């Protein structure tokens, strides 16, 4: 028994006519995906299908495989090709055949690190190939066999043998097939082509080896219940009885998140929207705590021209809780906006404002010229120029050593006023009050779904209830400390929790040489809710599909439960279910004056078997 990537039994494989001659010609070979490997089949009796291409971009920005065959050698290369739009192999006679087979496949091959030359692969001889690519290893399997069908796949059994295990290290997403037509836009000809394509899926198979070295039979353990029984018994034959095979579950159909109302909004609109702003040498540092910060408003607005955010990602900030948040405010020129960074130097960087190399904050900033400037300029923004020493980060003093800024409302960008807001987050030994918002959902009901009630996670079905909570309790618990009921944070109503269905599956079958029919029992499940076809009959042990409720009673043959038995009967043949009987009535003729005495006798011999001992073993 082995689990691998196999092609499922009894499926549809696609049949491509690469070239069709109706009158005229029709050339079309597409580019197909490469999911988990491919099964490729051909039966054409000529040298037309002559290799393959594998790759992702199929351009010169990445590497690509190339497998070519010319009836004398097989050449495998891994290079950085730039393939044509319609790649094909052109043989041109100088002569009829055996000439310089040109390469119209590509036009460039640079910087490439593989080569493999060997004996031909493709040596009416139906040919089958299987391709795989796992852990930087390209594996090929092949097999040839002669057939006589007109147009179909034979009904037999053959096993493919390994060919090559090349150690390439590239990524593969798409693949394409090569054809070498002829030479004789319309200056080339060809006869015909057709091939079968199929895809592999992860399955589990049961294979049989004979006394010699070959594989003879296989069983797929997903086709029907009988195959599942054969695979779970590790045998190709099954005796009469009832066997347990697998479990039955119900899957969630949606997701639910419920949280209390969004209040106590944190005043982020005071440091951004404000008629007055501070200067470079005198900040407006503000502390923020015990509030709910709406970060998504800031980075979803089409009015900020600088949002480079170091330390943390701008999107995960909604799932982090801090203790304190500090906000600054500068009004500087447009040229030094780049100087506010963990690493930078200059006038403003070293004299007015400096930042450490572990900032874990960011520098949201924008432009404003129609409001912060007037007709006369109003040079009311000052800054320092000379200092006795470099100023360390997170330190500034209040105090002609100061000069004003022009900000003339005609100059180009690079000198116009720009407003900068700088935020920092801190986590000290404290309950970390500051947290981000939490969104909710529409509270669907009556389906087995997943719920997140204010911190309670789980799966199940919700419904109304009659319980009454004291007006401070949130949820309830059972005897075994399992959650039973909850309360909606927004509507303050009580809801119950019930697990969605689950059970086991049993298969009822007669002996294997008799018939191939089965019946299926789903245990303890009311099957008005079963996802799933024959007669349906409900018992006290679950419900049964595939049997008819016969009308009489006999002795028990295959026990099921609660006094119900099943058997293979003849009246056409079928499987019937009934209630077992105990015996035949034997009412005795009792009076107060009659006796019965036997007159003649028999001698009887019976047998009894008893085990006495077992085997003596020892382990070191």
């Amino acid at each position, epitope marked *: 028994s082995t689990q691998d990537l196999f092609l499922p039994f009894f499926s549809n494989v696609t049949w491509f006519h690469a070239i069709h001659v109706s009158g005229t010609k029709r050339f079309d070979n597409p580019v197909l995906p490469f999911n988990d490997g491919v099964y490729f089949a051909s039966t054409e009796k000529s040298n037309i299908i002559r290799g393959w291409i594998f790759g992702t971009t199929l351009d010169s920005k990445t590497q690509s495989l190339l497998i070519v065959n010319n009836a004398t050698n097989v050449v495998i290369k891994v290079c950085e090709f730039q393939f044509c739009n319609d790649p094909f192999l052109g043989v041109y006679y100088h002569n009829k055949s055996w000439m310089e087979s040109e390469f119209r496949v590509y036009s460039s091959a640079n910087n490439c690190t593989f080569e493999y030359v060997s004996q031909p692969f493709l040596m009416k001889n139906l040919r089958e190939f299987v391709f795989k690519n796992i852990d930087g290893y390209f594996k090929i399997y092949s097999k040839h066999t002669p057939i006589n069908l007109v147009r179909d796949l034979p009904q037999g059994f053959s096993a493919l043998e390994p060919l090559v295990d090349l150690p390439i290290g590239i990524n593969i997403t798409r693949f394409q097939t090569l054809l070498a037509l002829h030479r004789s836009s319309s200056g080339w000809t060809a006869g015909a082509a057709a091939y079968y394509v199929g895809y592999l899926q992860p399955r589990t198979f049961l294979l049989k080896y004979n006394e010699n070295g070959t594989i003879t039979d296989a069983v797929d353990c997903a086709l029907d219940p009988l195959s599942e029984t054969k695979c779970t018994l590790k045998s190709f034959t099954v005796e009469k009885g009832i066997y347990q095979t697998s479990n039955f579950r119900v899957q969630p159909t949606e997701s639910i998140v419920r949280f209390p109302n969004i209040t106590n909004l944190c005043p982020f609109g005071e440091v951004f929207n404000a008629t007055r702003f501070a200067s470079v040498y005198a900040w407006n540092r503000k502390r923020i705590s015990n509030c709910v910060a709406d970060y998504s408003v800031l980075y979803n607005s*089409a009015s900020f021209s600088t949002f480079k955010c170091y330390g943390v990602s701008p999107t995960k900030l909604n799932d982090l809780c801090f203790t304190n948040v500090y906000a600054d405010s500068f009004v500087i020129r447009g040229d030094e906006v780049r100087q506010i960074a963990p690493g930078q130097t200059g006038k403003i960087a070293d004299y007015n404002y400096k930042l450490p190399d572990d900032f874990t904050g960011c520098v949201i900033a924008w432009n404003s010229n129609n409001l912060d400037s007037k007709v006369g300029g109003n040079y009311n923004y000052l800054y320092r120029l000379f200092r006795k020493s470099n100023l360390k980060p997170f330190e500034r003093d209040i105090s002609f050593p100061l000069q004003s800024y022009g900000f003339q409302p005609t100059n180009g960008v690079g000198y116009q006023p720009y407003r900068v807001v700088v935020l920092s987050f801190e986590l000290l030994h404290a309950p970390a009050t500051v947290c981000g918002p939490k969104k909710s959902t529409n509270l669907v009901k009556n389906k087995c779904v997943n719920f997140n009630f204010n911190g309670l996670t789980g799966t199940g079905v919700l419904t109304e209830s009659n319980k009454k909570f004291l007006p401070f309790q949130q949820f309830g618990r059972d005897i075994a400390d399992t959650t039973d009921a909850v309360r909606d944070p927004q509507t303050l109503e009580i809801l119950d929790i019930t697990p969605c269905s689950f059970g086991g599956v049993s298969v009822i079958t007669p002996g294997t040489n008799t018939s191939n029919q089965v019946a299926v029992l789903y245990q303890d499940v009311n099957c008005t809710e079963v996802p799933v076809g024959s007669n349906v009959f409900q018992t006290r042990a679950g419900c049964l599909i595939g049997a008819e409720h016969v009308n009489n009673s006999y002795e028990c043959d295959i026990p099921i439960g609660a006094g119900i038995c099943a058997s293979y009967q003849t009246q056409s043949q079928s499987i019937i279910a009934y209630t077992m009987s105990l015996g035949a009535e034997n009412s005795v003729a009792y009076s107060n004056n009659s006796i019965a005495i036997p007159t003649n006798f028999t001698i009887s011999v019976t047998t009894e078997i008893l085990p006495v001992s077992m085997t003596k073993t020892s382990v070191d």
Partner: antibody
Amino acid sequence: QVQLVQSGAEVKKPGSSVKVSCKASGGTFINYAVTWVRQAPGQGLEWMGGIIPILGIPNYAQKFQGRVTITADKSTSTAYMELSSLRSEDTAVYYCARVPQAGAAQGHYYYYYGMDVWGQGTTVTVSS
Amino acid sequence: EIVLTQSPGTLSLSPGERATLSCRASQSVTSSYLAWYQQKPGQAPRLLIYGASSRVTGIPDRFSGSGSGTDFTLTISRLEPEDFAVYYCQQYGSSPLTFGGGTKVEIK
């Protein structure tokens, strides 16, 4: 010459389900990637899902999980999308679109081109 | 989930001038995969530029695009009366595919 056509407008009540179809004519349709895009009135565009008919496994967005289902029929060459458990916010216009160059690699999808051919639009109004 | 933000909410211009539209991403787009769409009222969108540099055939030569990393830009050098519509930026280097927010360009 590849063109896609959709069905007509629909009006629904909350709690029901809707099914929209997309018929493409003039191409292979087998190795394409058929997507689905939703545009609300006076809003932007959103991504719902997509499918490659030859493979048979679709990809869904996280928001529309357990509520939408995308399938395809190769013989009639038609893609279906079904939306269940309707709310009052599921009133928008739906578009088919097509990505010409798509691959698979593992169970996920990989795109090497943008959508070039679009449908026409089907309005689904949900109210009572 | 990569989030794209279009910096100018609305642009008002005049015929014969040039425009400039930006599309900033929260992270770095993988392999610089970006596409630009132009939509008019009552009609489906239309693809103009893919790969942030390449241009689909049949699109006028006045449209161009550039950028990389987390900053991408689109330019129309010579505006025309038929160029006033909504514009969107989309990324397809990962999953799920995410669109922009739109940027109106009109004179009315």
